Design a protein around this nucleic acid. Structure first.
Ligand SMILES: [Mg+2]
Ligand SMILES: [Zn+2]
Ligand SMILES: [Zn+2]
Lengths: 109, 1270
DNA sequence: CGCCCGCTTCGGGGCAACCCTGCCAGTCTAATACAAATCCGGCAATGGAGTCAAGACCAGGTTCG
DNA sequence: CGAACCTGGTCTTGACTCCATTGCCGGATTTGTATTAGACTGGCAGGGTTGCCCCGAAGCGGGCG
């Protein structure tokens, strides 16, 4: 029916491809844990982030030793959490004693 | 090297990639199986289309939109993370996937021969059990710990089996006690004598099956002990239970894993050097199967040794992702999106990798994790090649998907579909019509098409004439077609050539360059004298108009590809501007002579004078317009502008009759005078009857002696005169003009009686079923011949059907025989003859059954025509890639070697009878030696073109054999010189120093196929030619001799037995398994016993294999054999091909030599290397201690010759792209781009014709004298 | 005694012309419950960006004494 | 020869309007995650017929430490 024609989801602009002056810009250095260095050109008036997902793909921090204490979140839910929220300590300790005397009565008779 | 790929190239070096190369190519790590947010239609973060990883979708805009101009470029937005740049980096930036478990690559595993298998010495049947998690593999073992805890653990084994026997004599003692209980309860009461011992048989059967239990588990323990003693790396422990027991009892002493990480561990623990030298030692000493497998592994082992390639890259750790625009998700108008079928495979890999990562993080049992790693392996295998191993991964509708390997393989890969043959702009097509008023270099062109071809030209020009304010009003003025655009269009067309393709382009003249001119209508008018080159009848054929643009392109079209500069063949040099068909008839009627016609010359006197003389052809034309002179009567004109023939010139003038003033009388017809006025002034008078062969000889002479423009104008004049007298010839077809032979019924009765007697003798049992068919076939062939003979003698000469044939215009005599007379024998669908046969002409009208018999042969012929074409075009496709590198480099090799030519063999009475096939085998060749005879003078010196007059001089002086050069023995390095190639058959002069004569050779060989029928078990047509060029072993193999002597002939059981009796002697060569279905070779008489055979005499009848005649009679005789054997086929179809084309191909066949001895330098035995490299290596290695590598010549077919080339790019683009690509990647075989398809591929300028630096770097300045005068 | 190798057969990948000409493929236990994120709708700090009115200000082309 | 003019802009000044642009701030919606207690325990299932060629794999008859 129609048509065929299609478009990539994005605009194609055309201006002057000038090279003589630009907006001036800095170069920051981020570092992964495993000794990898990466340089990222940020603009001048730009709040440079402390951590940055690098070209390698693992999370990389900045080479300046500030360490802004990101306060990493809790472990989500463990099997200990799903067990503890449906039982109690004296019951689990009772079962622990039962298996303890079970391996005892197995072993030495 | 260049990353943005400016056109500076010296190499193209493929190589097996490593993981540190892959995660250095990438700009990010794709880690989510998402493409586009469903609601905003923008790409996801860390997905398959992320603008952070792959670049922006919008020109100079980030993702959060905080930067939107060019002034922010090269920088990265500190919130969205998308580098602001141009939006064509999504064409080029790649990404990678960090896998959670290692995965083997599929090409180095699955494709036969397997490369992991040859590298590790593993079988593929058992390696598939490793990398698909079906069997364990031992990757390491401790030696000395096994060496002493072998004693300690066999002591422990003895303790264990003694405890087993403690259990076993517990069994013995317990059932002994229960068996004496069976005694004490069976023999202690009242019971039956057998029922008291059924419990005896019961407990004894219990002990039998119980000792079977103990015996089987002791056999299990014995098996596991034998396995731990004979444990070694590269071993496979199948049977899961045994491996688990073996590990948890002997958990030290060895490491052994399962899958691709274990293969990676084996590649880590693998000395290639000692392994390689062990293989060198095995080929130093071994034999048989071991030596062949040692060679086949030494190939890839030395391949990994020589280069700097670690073989660690055969397993894979990080998989890279093709850029987003190469797998684009484009939307159509209406939201129906279009993914590119790789996105689903990457989503499968990303899903399975993330699931593996969460399973390993969560802690999962071994079954689930190994299932997930097998799924990951199959996902990567489907990504690299879907459909390779197992079931192809389907999509919706059960359509197999298109992986990365399916983007290159076959006809629809990038190579054959988009690298070599492209849709082009500035183009158009239309249907064609005949243009008989055009000049030879002109052509028609419909103005409604030219106005769209030349639209930028006409746009510029009618801006320049102030008809438009600017370009946009000019474009709208074009699109509305305001009528002064046509007046501008004439000026932009004039002197600007166009090309005229016609698919299928069989040979070189399918593209020619014509000057266009404007034509009313919408059909391209083609000049009629290029129909023979284009193979273009006017049944509705269509031709494509191209348009050259640059000054170099217009000059190439104007000078090389023009119509009037390409008259002759490229193959045999006969003209293709020759006037054929209709025109020829016209000329025939114009130069034929009718005795007893109106107004002849009779010398009768006494009462009146002769009334035959005419003072001028002007007066003759006036007396022809009045009804006195016929055109075709014999008169005596007095000519003053035409050159008389050589005898009359030497008679009337002797030496220097110059014609524009002189006068001389001649008895000819008026038609021949009007005909000779077409030909130029220097050409002598002809005075014959213009048969088509006569016109061919005239145009060949006039093209060989005069310049080209004279030939073009003469051919145009012949076309005009031929049409104008073809109308007047009165050639019509009416059924009153198809006369039937009057004696036909008597002939049919006389052969009907013989058919009746053969049928009667079959009915009375005197002969079987086949011999009566053969007798009837021969009788009706005799009948067909007699009916055709009576038909031939019945017709007059001015019958138009026989006039068209005997002029030579078209049609053989058999078509007249089938119009009137007898159809004859009509073939079976299988190929035999139907014995009935058809006895009615097509004038009388056939009956029902006769027509139904004729349909068999008609449909068989038409389907055979279709399939052959496909095969002929495919043969041409193979030959072009074979001889793509035979281009003429030097002016002169300056050798002295060269072949001899048969050249008019000796008569038995003793004369020089001319050899009939001289024009294909002797002409257009340059002598290396001289012609001397009876200790006389030289006749033809060294290095002459050797045309017709010097061949006539040699046959006059009386020699038979000349030693002439050839492209077989041109001693230049890369392709032939010029003087070995001789005269270029297209120009008539010597070949240039830029020609691609391999392509011309390949096109002229596989061009005239199609029409190459077969015959009524030797293969005798196009499959015969194909098995010759493929260097196959033929079907009807007839073995040749090996040494002279008399023969040991014997007819064994149901087939033959032939042996050569030697003459020194030696060992008798015995030929046993020769079928009695064959025939013995006849010569001069049949092969009789005790007859003296040659060294390479052909024994039986059939086809000799070229390998055997290479091995017996060397390279020269197999060159003679191949050329003679192909040209035998092409002469059997009556097709003129000069031998130098076949010699170009055979010279490409006989390049390489084989290695039977390594010497001590670099050459694996059985490998095939080039001859020049072989000789240069021996020249290097005679110094530094002398040893020769021993070489023998090989004759290899053209597929293997094309695939074993030096450039991996051409061999990848030809055929078998996967295997060529993978072993080139192993060898790290760097291309040098020096060939001919490669520069076509990468778009730079090819090294042939106007591309080579002898012509591409010409400095062109104005001369100083005209500079000063300017 | 069990041990190994030369021909045979079975299987398996690759290829089989070329122009136009076409145009969009499938299916089921089902919901709550809550929280982070996102977004969007409406005033509310603006001050920057534009707009008009008015005039001061020249210093030169137009006319009277 | 000078007086007076009126008009080319040239530029500024001040007053007023409008309008984007964050900034809270609260409700709507949107997306992710978790949880449902009788028992339920190893797939559908389809195609596939050309012919020829080259090569590599498995096997069977042949002799042998
Ligand atoms: Mg046609
Ligand atoms: Zn952004
Ligand atoms: Zn040469």
């Amino acid at each position: 029916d129609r048509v065929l024609r299609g478009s990539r989801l994005g605009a194609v602009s055309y201006e002057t491809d000038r090279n003589h002056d630009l907006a001036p810009r800095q170069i920051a250095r981020y570092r992964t844990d495993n000794g990898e260095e990466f340089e990222v050109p940020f603009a001048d008036d730009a709040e440079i982030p402390g951590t940055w997902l690098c070209r390698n793909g693992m999370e990389g921090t900045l080479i300046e030793g500030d360490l802004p204490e990101p306060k990493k979140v809790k472990p989500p839910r463990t099997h200990w959490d799903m067990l503890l929220e449906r039982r109690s300590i004296e019951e689990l300790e009772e079962l622990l004693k039962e298996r303890l005397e079970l391996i005892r009565s197995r072993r030495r008779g | 090297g260049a990353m943005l790929d400016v056109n500076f190239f010296d190499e193209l070096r493929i190589g097996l990639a490593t993981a540190e190369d892959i995660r250095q190519w990438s700009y990010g790590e794709v880690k989510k199986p998402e493409t586009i947010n469903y609601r905003t239609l923008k790409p996801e973060k860390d997905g398959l289309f992320c603008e952070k990883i792959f670049g922006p979708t919008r020109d100079w805009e980030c993702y959060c939109g905080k930067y939107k101009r060019v002034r922010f470029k090269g920088i990265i937005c500190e919130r969205c993370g998308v580098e602001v740049t141009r939006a064509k980096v999504r064409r080029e930036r790649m990404g990678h996937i960090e896998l959670a478990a290692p995965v083997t690559h599929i090409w180095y595993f699955k494709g036969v021969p397997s490369r992991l298998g040859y590298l590790l010495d593993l079988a593929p049947k058992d390696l598939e059990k490793i990398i698909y998690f079906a069997a364990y593999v031992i990757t390491s073992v401790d030696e000395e710990m096994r060496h002493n805890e072998l004693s300690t653990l066999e002591a422990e084994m003895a303790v264990e089996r003694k405890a087993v026997e403690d259990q076993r004599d517990g069994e013995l003692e317990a059932r002994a006690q229960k068996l004496e209980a069976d005694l004490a309860e069976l023999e202690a009461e009242g019971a039956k004598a057998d029922a008291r011992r059924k419990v005896r048989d019961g407990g004894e059967r219990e002990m039998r099956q119980i000792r079977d239990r103990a015996q089987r588990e002791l056999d299990r323990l014995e098996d596991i002990w034998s396995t731990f003693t004979k444990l070694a790396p590269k071993q496979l422990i199948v049977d899961e239970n045994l491996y688990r027991e073996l590990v948890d009892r002997y958990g030290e002493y060895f490491t052994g894993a399962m899958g691709a990480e274990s293969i990676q561990k084996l590649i880590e623990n693998f000395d290639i050097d000692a392994e390689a030298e062990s293989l060198r030692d095995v080929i130093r000493n071994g034999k048989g199967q071991k030596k062949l497998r040692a060679l086949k592994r030494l190939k890839v082992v030395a391949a990994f040794q020589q280069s700097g390639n670690s073989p660690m890259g055969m397993v894979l750790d990080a998989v890279p992702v093709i850029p987003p625009e190469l797998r684009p998700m484009v939307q159509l108008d209406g939201g129906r999106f279009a993914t590119s079928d790789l996105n689903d495979l990457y989503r499968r890999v990303i899903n399975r990798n993330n699931r593996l990562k969460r399973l390993i993080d969560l802690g999962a049992p071994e079954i689930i994790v190994n299932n997930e790693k097998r799924m990951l392996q199959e996902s990567v295998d489907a990504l690299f090649d879907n459909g390779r191993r197992g079931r192809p991964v389907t999509g919706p509708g059960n359509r197999p998907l298109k992986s990365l390997s399916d983007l290159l393989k076959g006809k629809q890969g990038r190579f054959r579909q988009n690298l070599l043959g492209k849709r082009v702009d500035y183009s158009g097509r239309s249907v064609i019509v005949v243009g008989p008023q055009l000049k030879l270099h002109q052509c028609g062109l419909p103005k409604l098409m030219a106005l769209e071809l030349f639209k930028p030209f006409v746009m510029k020009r009618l801006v320049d004439l102030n008809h438009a304010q600017n370009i946009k009003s000019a474009k709208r003025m074009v699109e509305r077609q305001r009528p002064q655009v046509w007046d501008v269009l004439e000026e932009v067309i004039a002197e600007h050539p166009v090309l005229l393709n016609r698919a299928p382009t069989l040979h070189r003249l399918g593209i020619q360059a014509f000057e266009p001119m404007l034509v009313e209508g919408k059909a391209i008018q083609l000049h009629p004298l290029v129909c023979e080159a284009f193979n273009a009848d006017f049944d509705g054929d269509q031709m494509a108009v191209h348009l050259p643009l640059s000054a170099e392109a217009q000059a190439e079209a104007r000078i090389l590809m023009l119509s009037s500069n390409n008259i002759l063949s490229p193959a045999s040099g006969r003209p293709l501007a020759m006037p054929r068909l209709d025109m020829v008839t016209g000329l025939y009627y114009l130069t034929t002579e009718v005795p007893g016609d109106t107004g002849e010359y009779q010398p009768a006197s006494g009462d009146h004078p002769e009334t035959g003389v005419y003072s001028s052809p002007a007066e003759a034309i006036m007396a022809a317009d009045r009804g006195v002179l016929s055109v075709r009567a014999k008169i005596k004109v007095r000519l003053t502008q035409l050159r008389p023939p050589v005898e009359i010139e030497a008679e009337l003038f002797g030496h220097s009759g110059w014609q524009p003033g002189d006068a001389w009388m001649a008895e000819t017809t008026l038609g021949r005078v009007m005909f000779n006025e077409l030909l130029p002034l220097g050409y002598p008078f002809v005075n014959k009857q213009m048969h088509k062969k006569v016109q061919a000889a005239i145009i060949n002479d006039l093209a060989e002696r005069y310049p080209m423009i004279v030939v073009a104008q003469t051919v145009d004049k012949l076309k005009d005169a031929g049409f104008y007298w073809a109308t007047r010839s009165g050639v019509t077809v009416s059924m009153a003009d198809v006369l039937v032979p009057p004696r036909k019924k008597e002939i049919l009765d006389h052969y009907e009686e013989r058919a009746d007697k053969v049928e009667k003798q079959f009915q009375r049992g005197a002969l079987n079923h086949d011999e009566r068919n053969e007798a009837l076939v021969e009788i009706w062939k005799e009948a067909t011949d007699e009916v055709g003979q009576a038909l031939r003698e019945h017709y007059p000469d001015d019958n138009p059907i026989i006039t068209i044939v005997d002029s030579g215009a078209t049609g053989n005599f058999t078509q007249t025989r089938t119009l009137a007379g007898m159809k004859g024998l009509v073939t079976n669908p299988k190929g035999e003859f139907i014995p009935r046969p058809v006895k009615s002409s097509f004038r009388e009208g056939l009956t029902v059954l006769e027509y139904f018999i004729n349909t068999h042969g008609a449909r068989k012929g038409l389907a055979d025509t279709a399939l052959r074409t496909a095969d002929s075009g495919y043969l041409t496709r193979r030959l072009v890639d074979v001889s793509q590198d035979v281009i003429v480099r030097e002016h002169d090799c300056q050798t002295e070697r060269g072949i001899v030519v048969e050249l008019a063999e000796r008569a038995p009475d003793g004369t020089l009878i001319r050899d009939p096939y001289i024009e294909t085998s002797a002409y257009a060749r340059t002598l290396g030696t001289d012609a001397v005879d009876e200790a006389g003078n030289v006749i033809v010196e060294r290095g002459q073109d050797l045309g017709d007059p010097e061949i006539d001089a040699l046959l006059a002086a009386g020699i038979t054999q000349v030693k002439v050069r050839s492209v077989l023995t041109c001693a230049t390095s890369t392709g032939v010189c010029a003087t070995c190639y001789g005269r270029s058959m297209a120009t008539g002069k010597l070949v240039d120093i830029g020609e691609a004569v391999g392509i011309v050779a390949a096109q002229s060989i596989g061009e005239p196929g199609t029409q190459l029928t077969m015959r009524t078990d030797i293969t005798g047509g196009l499959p015969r030619v194909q098995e010759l060029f493929e260097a196959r072993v033929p079907r009807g193999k007839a073995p040749i001799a090996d040494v002279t002597g008399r023969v040991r002939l014997e007819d064994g059981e149901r087939f033959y037995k032939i042996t050569i009796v030697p003459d020194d002697g030696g060992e008798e060569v015995v030929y046993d398994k020769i079928s009695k279905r064959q025939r013995l070779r006849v010569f001069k008489r049949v092969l009789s016993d005790g007859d003296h055979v040659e060294v390479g005499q052909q024994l039986m009848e059939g086809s000799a294999d070229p390998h055997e005649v290479l091995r017996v009679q060397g390279p020269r005789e197999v060159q003679i054999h191949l050329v003679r054997e192909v040209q035998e086929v092409y002469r059997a179809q009556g097709v003129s091909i000069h031998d130098k084309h076949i010699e170009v191909i055979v010279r490409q066949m006989l390049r390489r030599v084989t290695i039977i001895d390594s010497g001590s330098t670099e050459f694996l035995p059985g490998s095939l290397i080039d001859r020049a490299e072989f000789e240069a290596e021996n020249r290097r290695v005679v110094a530094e201690g002398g040893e020769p590598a021993a070489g023998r010549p090989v004759l290899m077919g053209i597929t293997k010759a094309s695939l074993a080339t030096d450039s991996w790019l051409s061999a990848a683009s030809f055929q078998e792209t996967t295997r060529v690509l993978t072993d080139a990647a192993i060898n790290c075989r760097s291309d040098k781009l020096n060939g001919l398809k490669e520069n076509v591929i990468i778009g730079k300028l090819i090294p042939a014709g106007t591309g080579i630096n002898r012509y591409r770097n010409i400095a062109v300045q104005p001369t100083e004298e005209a500079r000063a005068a300017a």
